[PDB]
Amino acid sequence: IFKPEELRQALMPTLEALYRQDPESLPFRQPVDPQLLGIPDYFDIVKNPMDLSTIKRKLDTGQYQEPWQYVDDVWLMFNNAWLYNRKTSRVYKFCSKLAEVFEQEIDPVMQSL
Amino acid sequence: IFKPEELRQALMPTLEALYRQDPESLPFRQPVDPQLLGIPDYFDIVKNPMDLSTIKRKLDTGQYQEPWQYVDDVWLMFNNAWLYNRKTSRVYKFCSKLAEVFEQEIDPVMQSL
Numbered sequence: 736i737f738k739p740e741e742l743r744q745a746l747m748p749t750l751e752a753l754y755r756q757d758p759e760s761l762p763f764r765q766p767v768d769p770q771l772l773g774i775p776d777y778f779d780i781v782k783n784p785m786d787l788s789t790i791k792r793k794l795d796t797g798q799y800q801e802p803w804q805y806v807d808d809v810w811l812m813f814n815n816a817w818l819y820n821r822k823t824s825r826v827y828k829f830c831s832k833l834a835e836v837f838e839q840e841i842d843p844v845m846q847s848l
Numbered sequence: 849i850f851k852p853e854e855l856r857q858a859l860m861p862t863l864e865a866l867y868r869q870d871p872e873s874l875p876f877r878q879p880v881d882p883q884l885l886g887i888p889d890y891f892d893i894v895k896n897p898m899d900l901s902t903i904k905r906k907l908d909t910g911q912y913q914e915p916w917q918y919v920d921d922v923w924l925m926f927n928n929a930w931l932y933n934r935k936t937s938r939v940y941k942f943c944s945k946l947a948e949v950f951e952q953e954i955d956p957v958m959q960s961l
C-alpha cells in the first residue's frame with residue numbers, strides 16, 4: 736500500500752539533488768543517443784537504458800508504486816554508465832559523484848519509509 | 849593525422865572547464881533561440897551562430913579535422929556574444945569570464961599536441 740503523490744514529496748528532493756550537481760548531472764539529464772554521442776555499440780552492452788528525465792517523468796506521472804522501484808531505476812542509470820564507460824572517462828567519474836550524493840540523500844528518506 | 853577520439857580526449861577537458869563555469873556557461877549550453885528569448889534581431893546581427901552543445905556534438909561525431917577548427921568554433925561563440933549583447937549585460941560579462949578561462953586551459957593543450 737503506497738500512493739505516488741507522497742512518493743513525490745518523499746523522493747523528489749533526492750532526484751532534485753542529482754540535478755543540482757552541475758556539470759556532473761548533464762550527461763544524465765537525457766536518454767543516451769548512441770549516434771549523436773559517437774558510441775554506436777551502446778546497446779550491445781546496455782539493455783535497459785535509464786536517465787534523470789525518465790525517472791522524473793515516472794515520478795511526475797505515477798509509474799512508481801513502491802519507492803524501491805525509484806531506487807532501482809536510479810541505480811540502473813548509474814550501473815549502465817559504469818558498465819559501458821571506461822574507468823578513466825569523465826562520464827564514469829561524474830557517475831561516481833552522483834552515486835555518492837544519491838547514497839547520502841536516499842538513506843534517511845528510505846529509513847523513514 | 850588527428851583521429852576523432854584523439855582530438856576528443858585532448859580537447860574535451862577544455863570544453864569541461866567551460867561547462868564548469870556556473871552561471872557563466874548557462875546561456876551558452878544551447879543554441880540561441882530568438883523567439884523563446886524575445887530577440888528577433890539576433891540573426892540580423894549574428895550570421896554564424898555557435899554554442900557549446902554544437903561544439904560538443906562536432907567533437908563527439910569526429911567533425912573536426914584539426915584542433916584550430918575547435919578553437920575557432922569556441923571563439924566564434926564568444927565573438928557572437930560580445931558582438932550582440934551590450935557591455936553592461938549579464939551575457940557579455942559571462943562571455944568575458946568563459947574566454948579568460950578558455951585562454952588558460954587551451955594554452956597547455958595546443959602546445960601539448
Ligand SMILES: CC(=O)n1cc(C(=O)Nc2cc(CO[C@H]3CCCCO3)cc(C(=O)O)c2)c2ccccc21
Pocket residue numbers: 758759761762763765767772774815816819820825826863864867904
Ligand atoms: C550517460 C552516458 O553514458 N553518456 C552521456 C554522454 C554525454 O556526453 N551526454 C551528454 C552530455 C552533455 C553535456 O555534458 C557536458 C558535461 C561536462 C563535460 C562536457 O559535457 C549534454 C548532453 C545533452 O544535452 O544531450 C548529453 C556520453 C558521452 C560518451 C559516452 C557516454 C555518455
Ligand SMILES: CC(=O)n1cc(C(=O)Nc2cc(CO[C@H]3CCCCO3)cc(C(=O)O)c2)c2ccccc21
Pocket residue numbers: 871874875876878880885887928929932933938939
Ligand atoms: C548567447 C546569447 O547571446 N544569449 C543567451 C541568452 C540566454 O539567456 N540564454 C539562456 C540562458 C539560460 C540560463 O539563464 C541563466 C542566466 C544566469 C542565471 C539566471 O539564469 C537558459 C537558457 C535556456 O533554457 O535555453 C537560455 C540570451 C538572452 C538575451 C540575449 C542574448 C542571449
